[PDB]
Every structure is written in structure tokens, then in C-alpha cells.
């Protein structure tokens, strides 16, 4: 199945939920430190919940703030509300 | 010889600019000025109290890697402009100050809100420059009293609450001083002519008085001398 | 295969430190060794530090 | 536990006998399950 990008990802916590928007993306200006979670992305898992955690997390010794959000939307797919 | 020894006093002040001063003292021993002169000179560069701005706040911008509309300055800029803002605090020790201007025109320190207890030293000092007849800015800065330098990365460290998206932080240099020379000459006492005058120059912010500034260093080389008096 | 990009751009100010690498135009290079205070400097009569 | 190593060629039964089992399909993985 396909991979949606929503701000609703299972085993984590709501601090960890607190920077993103309710689109599933990092808000412009927030500050971002190693293994923090930018773009909420959900995998779908086997066919054997029934979604894995594929998130963009910070690399680990990253710091930095976030400047600039750019999303590329292939045509046919419903645009979210950061786009 | 044992108990010969001249008390220096400070017998005069010379002001000759906001900024720069020079203060005198006499009389001194022979040895006793470069001693005193290098003694204060250390003390006095690197641990004057003084108020520095710590945290900026704008109405309309997130980050400082921004710009924003119908000002000629970035975001960046204008913190850099406001790091060397020199403003003096009375008692609060921790004062929010509140710019608003508006209309085409050099935004300096002069616009800042009224503050009975702080006081601008220099009213000219350009902050940022308003290109548009609609723009406007509106800004809170945060003056904070403390002594060195404590870049804002170490200030990230306290963690209460973090911090709202928009409060930029800006490196604190809490030194007023920024030039110090002293120099020993011939000093006429009586008829004695072993004696020695040292005259100090120094160069800073215009937030401190040389005055007070050389009784702090004073009286912080005495504190430090206390543990040499009783060596146990 | 993709139907979604996500770019996330982080801006970090470097500050200089000792082992940070400087140079001149010259040919003349090398790393800081020690970040000394103001006092520390040789200063000239005029009590400028270097 | 062991002080020297032996080298040669391999004969058919020897291979037989390091086998667990013998490969009849070129499929890898189902792709639907893992």
C-alpha cells in the first residue's frame, strides 16, 4: 500500500508530537536537536496497528532551526494544508 | 622603610568624552604602579559588571534567518545591531523594554519605550531602517545584568518550558569596558622625588563611571588578597 | 513510485573554536590552538590587543 | 581447538554432505509477506 504522511504515528509520545503541525510536518522556527521526529510518516506493514513507524528524525549530533519546508506533491494526490 | 610606604589616593578624574576617561593616582611607591596599573587593568577587563540585551522578541518573525517586510535590515542584522545596544539598569536587574515605530526612517535606540529605572547612554545608536510607509515593527527586548561573556549556546542549557517559536537569542558581552592603558610617571610630592602617578585611560560603553568602576576592581583585589593575609 | 517529497532545511551558526582550520592568502595555515581572553593579548602603548 | 588448516578440492559426495538441503527456485522473497 502507499506510505501517507500524517501527524498521527503509533509509540510515540505527545511531546515528541508537540512540534508538528496537524499535517504531520515541523513547524517553520522550531528548534530541532538530534533524534527529534520532523515529517510524520507511516509505512504499511505485513499482511501477517498494521503500520510501522518510517518517520524523518534528526540525525543524531544534529542541532539547527528549521528555516524552510518545501513539498513536492505528485499530480493526483490530495495536497495537505502545508502545501 | 617598613612602615614608609605612601597610600595611593585617586586625586583626579578627567572626562574628556562620554566614553573615554582617565583617572589618576598618587602617590605610589616605586614598583607599586606597574604592579597596580597590570593588577587593574586585568581585573577591569574581564570582570566589570554590566546590562547587555539577551533575548529579542518581534511580532512577525519566527527565526532569525528571516527577513521581514518593508525593513532594510535583516533579521540577523538587527540582532547583531542590538548586541551592541548599551543600556543601563538601576535595581530591576532584569528589564522587558517595547519598541514601536512606524513610517520611512532610521529606527535607533531613542524610540524605545519610556523606563524610569533604565537609561540609554547613547539615544543615537541605529537599530534598523524602515523603507515603506505601512511598515512597522514592534519588539521586545530583554536586558539582563551579569559579568563576561556568556554566548547563548550555554543559555540554552536551562530547560523549564523551552522556548515559543519567535524568541531569537542574542550573545551577551556584559563587559562596559573595552580599551584599558595605564602609564607611570614622575610624581612631585614634598621634596621627595622616589614616587611614582599612575594614570589609567580607559575606553568603554559609557554605561559605568570610571570611579566606580576602579573601586570594584579595588575592592575585588582585596577580596582575592584576603586568602594571601591568612595563609593558614 | 513516490507520490510525496518532504525538504526540511536546518540552519546552523557555526561559532570559531581551537581546531577549527584557518589560513591566509599566502600559503600560511593552521588550526587554533587556544582561545585566550582579552587580557591575555600583547597590547601596544595605546592598549590596543592584538 | 585447531592448529593447522587443510586445503583441497571438493568432491561431489562432500559437497552433498555440507548441504542442509537443495535449491530448486530462483524466488528470493514473496514480497507480499516478508
Same mark, same amino acid.
Given at each position: 500500500?502507499?506510505?501517507? +504522511?500524517?501527524?498521527?504515528?503509533?509509540?510515540?509520545?505527545?511531546?515528541?508530537? !508537540?512540534?508538528?503541525?496537524? !499535517?504531520? +510536518?515541523?513547524?517553520?522556527?522550531?528548534?530541532?536537536?538530534?533524534?527529534? +521526529?520532523?515529517?510524520?510518516? %507511516?509505512?504499511?506493514?505485513?499482511?501477517? !496497528?498494521?503500520?510501522?513507524?518510517? !518517520?524523518?528524525?534528526?540525525?543524531?549530533?544534529?542541532?539547527?532551526?528549521?528555516?524552510? %519546508?518545501?513539498?513536492?506533491?505528485?499530480?493526483?494526490?490530495?495536497?495537505?494544508?502545508?502545501? | 622603610?617598613?612602615?614608609?610606604?605612601?597610600?595611593?589616593?585617586?586625586?583626579?578624574?578627567?572626562?574628556?568624552?562620554?566614553?573615554?576617561? @582617565?583617572?589618576?593616582?598618587?602617590?605610589?611607591?616605586?614598583?607599586?604602579?606597574?604592579?597596580?596599573?597590570?593588577?587593574?587593568?586585568?581585573?577591569?577587563?574581564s570582570s566589570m559588571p554590566g546590562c547587555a540585551v539577551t533575548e529579542v522578541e518581534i511580532d512577525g518573525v519566527l527565526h532569525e534567518y528571516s527577513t521581514k517586510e518593508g525593513v532594510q535590515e535583516d533579521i540577523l542584522e538587527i540582532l547583531l545591531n542590538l548586541k551592541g545596544?548599551?543600556?543601563?539598569?538601576?535595581?530591576?536587574?532584569?528589564?522587558?523594554?517595547?519598541?514601536? @515605530?512606524?513610517?520611512?526612517?532610521?529606527?535607533?535606540?531613542? #524610540?524605545?519605550?519610556? #523606563?524610569?529605572?533604565?537609561?540609554?547612554? @547613547?539615544?543615537?545608536?541605529?537599530?534598523?531602517?524602515?523603507? #515603506?510607509?505601512?511598515?512597522?515593527?514592534?519588539?521586545?527586548?530583554?536586558?539582563?545584568?551579569?559579568?563576561?561573556?556568556?554566548?547563548?549556546?550555554?543559555?540554552?542549557?536551562?530547560?523549564?518550558? /523551552?522556548?515559543?517559536?519567535?524568541?531569537?537569542?542574542?550573545?551577551?558581552?556584559?563587559?562596559?569596558?573595552?580599551?584599558?592603558?595605564?602609564?607611570?610617571?614622575?610624581?612631585?610630592?614634598?621634596?621627595?622625588?622616589?614616587?611614582?602617578?599612575?594614570?589609567?585611560?580607559?575606553?568603554?560603553?559609557?554605561?559605568? #563611571?570610571?570611579? /566606580?568602576?576602579?573601586?570594584?576592581?579595588?575592592?575585588?583585589?582585596?577580596?582575592?588578597?584576603?586568602?594571601?593575609?591568612?595563609?593558614? | 513510485?513516490?507520490?510525496?517529497?518532504?525538504?526540511?532545511?536546518?540552519?546552523?551558526?557555526?561559532?570559531?573554536?581551537?581546531?577549527?582550520?584557518?589560513?591566509?592568502?599566502?600559503?600560511?595555515?593552521?588550526?587554533?590552538?587556544?582561545?585566550?581572553?582579552?587580557?591575555?593579548?600583547?597590547?601596544?602603548?595605546?592598549?590596543?590587543?592584538? | 581447538?585447531?592448529?593447522?588448516?587443510?586445503?583441497?578440492?571438493?568432491?561431489?559426495?562432500?559437497?552433498?554432505?555440507?548441504?542442509?538441503?537443495?535449491?530448486?527456485?530462483?524466488?528470493?522473497?514473496?514480497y507480499r509477506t516478508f
Open positions: 500500500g502507499p506510505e501517507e +504522511i500524517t501527524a498521527d504515528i503509533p509509540n510515540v509520545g505527545e511531546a515528541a508530537l !508537540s512540534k508538528l503541525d496537524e !499535517s504531520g +510536518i515541523v513547524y517553520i522556527g522550531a528548534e530541532v536537536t538530534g533524534g527529534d +521526529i520532523l515529517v510524520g510518516k %507511516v509505512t504499511p506493514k505485513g499482511e501477517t !496497528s498494521d503500520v510501522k513507524d518510517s !518517520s524523518l528524525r534528526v540525525p543524531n549530533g544534529v542541532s539547527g532551526t528549521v528555516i524552510d %519546508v518545501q513539498v513536492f506533491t505528485r499530480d493526483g494526490v490530495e495536497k495537505d494544508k502545508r502545501a | 622603610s617598613v612602615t614608609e610606604f605612601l597610600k595611593p589616593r585617586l586625586v583626579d578624574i578627567e572626562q574628556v568624552s562620554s566614553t573615554h576617561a @582617565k583617572v589618576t593616582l598618587e602617590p605610589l611607591e616605586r614598583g607599586f604602579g606597574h604592579t597596580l596599573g597590570n593588577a587593574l587593568r586585568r581585573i577591569l577587563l545596544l548599551a543600556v543601563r539598569v538601576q535595581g530591576k536587574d532584569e528589564v522587558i523594554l517595547t519598541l514601536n @515605530k512606524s513610517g520611512i526612517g532610521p529606527v535607533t535606540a531613542a #524610540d524605545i519605550t519610556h #523606563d524610569g529605572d533604565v537609561e540609554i547612554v @547613547k539615544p543615537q545608536h541605529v537599530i534598523c531602517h524602515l523603507t #515603506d510607509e505601512n511598515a512597522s515593527i514592534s519588539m521586545r527586548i530583554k536586558v539582563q545584568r551579569g559579568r563576561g561573556y556568556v554566548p547563548a549556546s550555554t543559555r540554552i542549557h536551562s530547560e523549564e518550558d /523551552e522556548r515559543p517559536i519567535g524568541r531569537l537569542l542574542v550573545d551577551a558581552c556584559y563587559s562596559p569596558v573595552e580599551r584599558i592603558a595605564y602609564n607611570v610617571e614622575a610624581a612631585r610630592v614634598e621634596q621627595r622625588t622616589d614616587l611614582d602617578k599612575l594614570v589609567i585611560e580607559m575606553e568603554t560603553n559609557g554605561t559605568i #563611571d570610571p570611579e /566606580e568602576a576602579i573601586r570594584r576592581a579595588a575592592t575585588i583585589l582585596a577580596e582575592q588578597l584576603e586568602a594571601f593575609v591568612d595563609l593558614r | 513510485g513516490v507520490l510525496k517529497i518532504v525538504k526540511v532545511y536546518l540552519a546552523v551558526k557555526r561559532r570559531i573554536q581551537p581546531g577549527d582550520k584557518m589560513a591566509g592568502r599566502h600559503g600560511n595555515k593552521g588550526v587554533i590552538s587556544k582561545i585566550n581572553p582579552i587580557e591575555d593579548m600583547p597590547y601596544d602603548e595605546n592598549g590596543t590587543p592584538v | 581447538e585447531f592448529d593447522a588448516i587443510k586445503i583441497a578440492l571438493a568432491s561431489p559426495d562432500m559437497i552433498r554432505s555440507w548441504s542442509f538441503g537443495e535449491v530448486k527456485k530462483p524466488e528470493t522473497i514473496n
